[PDB]
Amino acid sequence: SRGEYVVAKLDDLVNWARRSSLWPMTFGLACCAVEMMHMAAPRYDMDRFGVVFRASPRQSDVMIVAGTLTNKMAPALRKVYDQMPEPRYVVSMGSCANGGGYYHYSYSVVRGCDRIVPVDIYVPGCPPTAEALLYGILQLQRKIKREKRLRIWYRR
Amino acid sequence: MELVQVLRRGLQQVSGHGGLRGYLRVLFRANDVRVGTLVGEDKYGNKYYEDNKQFFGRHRWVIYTTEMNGRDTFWDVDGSMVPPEWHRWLHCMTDDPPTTKPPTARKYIWTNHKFNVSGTPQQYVPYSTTRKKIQEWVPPSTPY
Amino acid sequence: MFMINILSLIIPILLAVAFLTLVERKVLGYMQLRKGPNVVGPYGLLQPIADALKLFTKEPLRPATSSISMFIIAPILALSLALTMWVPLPMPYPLINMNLGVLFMLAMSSLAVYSILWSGWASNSKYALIGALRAVAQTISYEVTLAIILLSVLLMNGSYTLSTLITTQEHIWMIFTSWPLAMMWFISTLAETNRAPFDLTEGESELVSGFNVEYAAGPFAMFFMAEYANIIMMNAFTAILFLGASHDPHTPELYTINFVLKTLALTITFLWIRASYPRFRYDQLMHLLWKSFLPLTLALCMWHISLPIMTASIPPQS
Amino acid sequence: VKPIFSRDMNEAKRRVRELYRAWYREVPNTVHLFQLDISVKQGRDKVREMFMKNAHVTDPRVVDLLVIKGKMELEETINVWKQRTHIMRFFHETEAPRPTDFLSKFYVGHDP
Amino acid sequence: KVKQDMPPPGGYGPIDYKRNLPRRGLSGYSMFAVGIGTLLFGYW
Amino acid sequence: HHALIPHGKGGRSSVSGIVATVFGATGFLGRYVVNHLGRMGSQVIVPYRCEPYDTMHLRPMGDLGQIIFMEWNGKDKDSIRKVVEHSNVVINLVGREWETKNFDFEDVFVKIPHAIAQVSKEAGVEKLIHISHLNADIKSPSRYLRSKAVGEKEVRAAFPEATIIKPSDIFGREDRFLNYFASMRWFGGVPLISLGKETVKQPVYIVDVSKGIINAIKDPDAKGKTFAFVGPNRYLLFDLVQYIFAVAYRPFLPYPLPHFAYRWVGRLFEVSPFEPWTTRDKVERVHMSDMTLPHLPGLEDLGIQATPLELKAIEVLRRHRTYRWLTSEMEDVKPAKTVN
Amino acid sequence: TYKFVNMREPSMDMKSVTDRAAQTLLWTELVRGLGMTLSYLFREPATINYPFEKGPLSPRFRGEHALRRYPSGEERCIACKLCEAVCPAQAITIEAEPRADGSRRTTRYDIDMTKCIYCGFCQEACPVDAIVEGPNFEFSTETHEELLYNKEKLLNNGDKWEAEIAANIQADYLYR
Numbered sequence A: 001s002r003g004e005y006v007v008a009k010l011d012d013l014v015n016w017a018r019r020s021s022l023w024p025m026t027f028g029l030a031c032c033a034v035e036m037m038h039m040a041a042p043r044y045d046m047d048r049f050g051v052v053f054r055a056s057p058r059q060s061d062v063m064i065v066a067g068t069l070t071n072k073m074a075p076a077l078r079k080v081y082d083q084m085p086e087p088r089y090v091v092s093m094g095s096c097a098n099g100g101g102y103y104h105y106s107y108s109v110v111r112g113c114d115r116i117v118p119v120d121i122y123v124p125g126c127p128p129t130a131e132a133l134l135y136g137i138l139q140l141q142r143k144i145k146r147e148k149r150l151r152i153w154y155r156r
Numbered sequence B: 001m002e003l004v005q006v007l008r009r010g011l012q013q014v015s016g017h018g019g020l021r022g023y024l025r026v027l028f029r030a031n032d033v034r035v036g037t038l039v040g041e042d043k044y045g046n047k048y049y050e051d052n053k054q055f056f057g058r059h060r061w062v063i064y065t066t067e068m069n070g071r072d073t074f075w076d077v078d079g080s081m082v083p084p085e086w087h088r089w090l091h092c093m094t095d096d097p098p099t100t101k102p103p104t105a106r107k108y109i110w111t112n113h114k115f116n117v118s119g120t121p122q123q124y125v126p127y128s129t130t131r132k133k134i135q136e137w138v139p140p141s142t143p144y
Numbered sequence C: 001m002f003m004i005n006i007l008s009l010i011i012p013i014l015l016a017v018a019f020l021t022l023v024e025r026k027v028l029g030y031m032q033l034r035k036g037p038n039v040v041g042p043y044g045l046l047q048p049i050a051d052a053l054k055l056f057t058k059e060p061l062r063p064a065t066s067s068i069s070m071f072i073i074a075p076i077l078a079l080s081l082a083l084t085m086w087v088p089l090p091m092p093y094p095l096i097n098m099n100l101g102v103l104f105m106l107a108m109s110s111l112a113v114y115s116i117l118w119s120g121w122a123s124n125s126k127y128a129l130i131g132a133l134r135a136v137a138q139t140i141s142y143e144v145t146l147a148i149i150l151l152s153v154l155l156m157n158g159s160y161t162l163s164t165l166i167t168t169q170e171h172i173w174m175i176f177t178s179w180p181l182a183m184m185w186f187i188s189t190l191a192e193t194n195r196a197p198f199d200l201t202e203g204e205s206e207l208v209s210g211f212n213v214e215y216a217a218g219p220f221a222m223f224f225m226a227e228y229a230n231i232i233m234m235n236a237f238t239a240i241l242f243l244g245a246s247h248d249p250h251t252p253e254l255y256t257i258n259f260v261l262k263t264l265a266l267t268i269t270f271l272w273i274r275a276s277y278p279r280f281r282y283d284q285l286m287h288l289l290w291k292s293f294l295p296l297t298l299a300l301c302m303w304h305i306s307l308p309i310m311t312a313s314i315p316p317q318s
Numbered sequence D: 001v002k003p004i005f006s007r008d009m010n011e012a013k014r015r016v017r018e019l020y021r022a023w024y025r026e027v028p029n030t031v032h033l034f035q036l037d038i039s040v041k042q043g044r045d046k047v048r049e050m051f052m053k054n055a056h057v058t059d060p061r062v063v064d065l066l067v068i069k070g071k072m073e074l075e076e077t078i079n080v081w082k083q084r085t086h087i088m089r090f091f092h093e094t095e096a097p098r099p100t101d102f103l104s105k106f107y108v109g110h111d112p
Numbered sequence E: 001k002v003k004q005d006m007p008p009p010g011g012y013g014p015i016d017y018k019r020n021l022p023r024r025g026l027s028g029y030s031m032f033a034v035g036i037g038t039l040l041f042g043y044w
Numbered sequence F: 001h002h003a004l005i006p007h008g009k010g011g012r013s014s015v016s017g018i019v020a021t022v023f024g025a026t027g028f029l030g031r032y033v034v035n036h037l038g039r040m041g042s043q044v045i046v047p048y049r050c051e052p053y054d055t056m057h058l059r060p061m062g063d064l065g066q067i068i069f070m071e072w073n074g075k076d077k078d079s080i081r082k083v084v085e086h087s088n089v090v091i092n093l094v095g096r097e098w099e100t101k102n103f104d105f106e107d108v109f110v111k112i113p114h115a116i117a118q119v120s121k122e123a124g125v126e127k128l129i130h131i132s133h134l135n136a137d138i139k140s141p142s143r144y145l146r147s148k149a150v151g152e153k154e155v156r157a158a159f160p161e162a163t164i165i166k167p168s169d170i171f172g173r174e175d176r177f178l179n180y181f182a183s184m185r186w187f188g189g190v191p192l193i194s195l196g197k198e199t200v201k202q203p204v205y206i207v208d209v210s211k212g213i214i215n216a217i218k219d220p221d222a223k224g225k226t227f228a229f230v231g232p233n234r235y236l237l238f239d240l241v242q243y244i245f246a247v248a249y250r251p252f253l254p255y256p257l258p259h260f261a262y263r264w265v266g267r268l269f270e271v272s273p274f275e276p277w278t279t280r281d282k283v284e285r286v287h288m289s290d291m292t293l294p295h296l297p298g299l300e301d302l303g304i305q306a307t308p309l310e311l312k313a314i315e316v317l318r319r320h321r322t323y324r325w326l327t328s329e330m331e332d333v334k335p336a337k338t339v340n
Numbered sequence G: 001t002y003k004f005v006n007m008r009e010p011s012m013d014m015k016s017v018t019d020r021a022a023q024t025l026l027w028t029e030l031v032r033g034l035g036m037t038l039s040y041l042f043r044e045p046a047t048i049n050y051p052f053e054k055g056p057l058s059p060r061f062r063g064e065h066a067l068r069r070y071p072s073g074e075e076r077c078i079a080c081k082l083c084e085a086v087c088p089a090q091a092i093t094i095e096a097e098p099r100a101d102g103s104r105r106t107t108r109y110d111i112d113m114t115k116c117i118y119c120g121f122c123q124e125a126c127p128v129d130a131i132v133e134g135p136n137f138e139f140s141t142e143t144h145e146e147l148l149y150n151k152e153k154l155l156n157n158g159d160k161w162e163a164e165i166a167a168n169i170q171a172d173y174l175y176r
Ligand SMILES: NC(=O)C1=CN([C@@H]2O[C@H](COP(=O)(O)OP(=O)(O)OC[C@H]3O[C@@H](n4cnc5c(N)ncnc54)[C@H](OP(=O)(O)O)[C@@H]3O)[C@@H](O)[C@H]2O)C=CC1
Pocket: F023, F024, F025, F026, F027, F028, F029, F030, F048, F049, F050, F074, F092, F093, F094, F095, F096, F097, F103, F108, F112, F131, F132, F133, F134, F166, F167, F168, F169, F170, F171
């Protein structure tokens, strides 16, 4: 159907815009943030891919939970995620963020950021290498490329 | 002047990639139009190039195949597509390409490398690998 | 056909702003041993379009504590004023030729400041309020020195008509006559556009995002477009005022090319300064302008008032 | 034994009453600032319940230390150091009711 | 024969470790003279 | 056959023994049902027909492995069989207040539930929970409730031992009932047919409904019984809307509107290709007074005491307040007059 | 032993005063910084063209865990559980039973890639070289459960990366 073709092409345009311009928020909890900065560094510059760190949650599109999320910090993380406008995607970097890692059995650690906020891509490692984080970001971009919001709207 | 030489080198880059169409193809797919020595090509189609003149970290690069394991990778390429044998050459763990120094042949080693399969029907699903520990009594089938 | 002219001025300027974002990202990256955006489009050309589409397809949030009317009005004011200021500029022939175009631009720049203050106040957030107050302090610091420098330079022009600047600088650039005023004017333009080292209103490092901390999606895109358009417009004003260009009336394209190149160079200098220098403290900015720029500007204004009289070089009024 | 703040139980009771006054007056301000959906009566009942939980204490030093901890919590609430999550944790809304009768515990699980 | 990662026989070459911020530019008198000359020519 | 012994203390990591397929879990009621299931430790299988992004909010609700998302199509029975194959419980919460080009009221409230019930009976699922409005009846003016009654009949036919829960308007943060009335402020005055004096409604809190569903799953007696879920108090529509505007601290301007004019307005909003703001069916259902069905068992039978609207109204309606009234306490607005 | 940063006094001669006055009025030092930035503009960028270009790594890299086999095809693991014992994060769960042949093999071998700290232990600890952190670093997943590896998954990884893992072990086995 011509309507299906138009919807598919418009969805392609929107997904391309969203994946090409991915603005992570300046959120780094722990050692994994340093590998994130190295990703921002010249060798693996993420600005080439359109990933620009923006501080304000309302002006950001992706939250990368780099570092251990303590029970004290979890409400702030949830608040920052909520204040972030949608579409919003969450990437969990490092074993500490993914499932608690080295401090899984600590009283003051949330055993994974999945408990607090929905996570789209999990980047393994402790710390994950900057190339690994870039791979995760590109995987998130492909995931956005696979999204079918307008097609589902037309079919619904 | 050196400027004329640089422009001529750009034209040589255009020719070396197979013409304007190949030049544009490489530019869009990989964003790099450098021409380098083709060290080899894997069974999946990935072509590996080397330019020792370029600084460390750019001397070796791989042009991912357009089709691998039944997936169209003309635009969607990923690091996992690199087969293990060429992985060490690409990541500079070794200085010898697999063609020059082949890996040891073992029966158990996979013959077809699979890329990251997360988000696909082939994605790994965790499960317990141990049998039931406690066995329950089976009631008798006779009434009494 | 005047509507066609207005659209011709507006639409290309916005595209220029979009590609200025790409240029800045690449120039800063290369000055930082990086490559600016290159993945999205050939040499990163399509990155702006992707950013605009992403922002305008992103949910806009109206803060619960915000005053909605001012919250919405402020970006509209910023963008409309940014586009309006381009109208009087002679490139080479102005869209609207005003006898007092320079004062018009000064007043319009004064009006644009309220967009930042209104946005910050309506946001009803502490960081936004701090950014608005910083914008107030910045205007207090820079407006007087800007006006005095412009008056001193325009004394040689003989009028506030922008077009007549071309005739005055027919034989030589005015920077040779007034290079100190030119330096102070360039710094003052940096201050007015809220650009580094005077990027205090936004002040990401110190204030999470400054006045726009509570703005998302389209309104933030409008604020960004206003900012970049103001950068380009102020640099074009500097090019017209000091770095004059040859105008052949039969071929305006030559003047247009020269002017565009000079403005591009000045905007590149803006990005260069943003990369090189650190940021000032707003107390330090106000002190610089009031304690250092203002006395020298007063002395040079006296000098430029006297010089045409003592050298019999009073410019023609017409 | 060295007294923490009070040498006898009556003095500790006086301190406890002062702390209770402070919490009782603070409760409405807490509901307003934290935008809690509980009523003021509900919060003050929770305050009484928290005070009553430790009503069995008979040692002056333990009572003084409890008053110190309560004052620290009150300081947290008076400031916004504690978030709405921390304030509402006293009300275990998410946790399901746990039966205390013998038969219900026997049915549900092996727990004593 | 033992083969460990050891310094080259005779040691490595000296490594510079001190500030080398260069001395550049004209004298202040000269810069002021150039500015004033430009001002005068522009005025004429 | 698919029977699991419950283990643990009822926490996130515990095994409740409940394996469920919550159809229409990506919705107002589905969110709370899935959250309650996950907190116990139950395995929740979510069939989703939308984009995976919209299902992301349900991902944190359960522990690792508890929540499994499988794409399903209402028209295709094989997807229903795949989703319900290994479940000991199936909950059908698929309902759209507005008809769509692909799926009309008949398909969503009759065909879909019937296919779900038939496939569940074939698969061997022990228990099925179906949701139909309390006001559902075959002679009702609204097509929505008419199809709801027909679907209830068909579901009982396909699954004889099926629990059917008949809930009233379910007020909650994501509700389209309180938000619907509050959103009418944007249009100026609040249009009411007969000014709302003739209509009486008995709203139910969303959390109460979800807890009732979970207890019905837990309760052995619930099989083959129809429960009616209703709130503690009955209100006239005028009083309820006035209370909504009072708690929202928004000016109330009730103006009577003829029924035909309201129906024409509903037709106007039905034109929207996207989710319609209001529909003629929406107007009819709003005007229709909530039925009183003493015969059917209610929340009290399942052990849950209905929360009054007064207690939870501020949660839903605080967001609609302006900056001046955002911090106002719940107690400032007195309870509305109750027709009981 | 100690050096004085700062602790320098400017000259007061007229020439030095004029030079400092020129620096203040004519902004010389800011111009020097601008020149440095320009020089960096004209220097070659350091960005690598990932994914097409990959950063250097050594044979001692610690990445995705893998279970190796002997050349025969028998699994090297002998269910020592000492590698489980040395795990700093307790990320390895091992259960074993005598197999039909009678050999000591692992019925269960699980590494939680979400509790692992990628310390590199149990590669040093494991006596038979069975468990090895291989070269792979790009094993990101879209779900948490995918990162809870199983014995089957680990053995599949070992089979997949055995060619590279063996070469790296050969490179670094003498250093160990
Ligand atoms: N007040 C109440 O809420 C009342 C509840 N009910 C019934 O209980 C349920 C409550 O849901 P509600 O809170 O209104 O939220 P929704 O309207 O969002 O519920 C619909 C759910 O089913 C899915 N769905 C909708 N249409 C279709 C379709 N044609 N095919 C397949 N799936 C579909 C939706 O997902 P998606 O968005 O992807 O389509 C969503 O998960 C409904 O079935 C409703 O009729 C009964 C009486 C009153």
